[PDB]
Write a protein that binds this ligand. Sequence first.
Ligand SMILES: [Zn+2]
Ligand SMILES: [Zn+2]
Lengths: 89, 92
Amino acid sequence: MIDEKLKGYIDKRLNEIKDKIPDKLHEDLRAAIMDINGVELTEEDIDRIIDLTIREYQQSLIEPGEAIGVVTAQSVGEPGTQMTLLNVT
Amino acid sequence: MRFCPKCGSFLKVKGNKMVCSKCGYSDHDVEKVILKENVAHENDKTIIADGETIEGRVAISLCPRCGSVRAILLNKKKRLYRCMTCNFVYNI
Ligand SMILES: [Zn+2]
Ligand SMILES: [Zn+2]
């Protein structure tokens, strides 16, 4: 059970990162933090969760110059050799 | 089936007579020849695929993978099925 003070702190701390990640990720983070029960939650915990989420998103970005066409072709065609079978095709 | 006693060709029914076209023979006996073909509709009814068992665990259910309508009800509470054609396990 999160009291109104901590909920207000969460809402204030979540509104300054709206431009730092995609909207769906922000919604998922907000929905996930509100479901924490059985643990006494702290402001430092919220800070760490938000910072780790932003850092984790930033660390996953693709790099310029990547030969993504060859990688996509190899990722699609490689499992094609592992396929071992109205009676649709 | 009848044949002409002289020419040997087959006789066809014309009116009350059977006439040989090659020799003109005729007779008072008439024999009817028909060709009958049978069509079977054992498996042509309309299928209704509700996951209800018929005998044992054999149910009628459409497989999402191959599309066969034969399934085995593996578990009733989860509605868990298994295709009998490709062994695919699914939920309906
Ligand atoms: Zn004849
Ligand atoms: Zn199947």
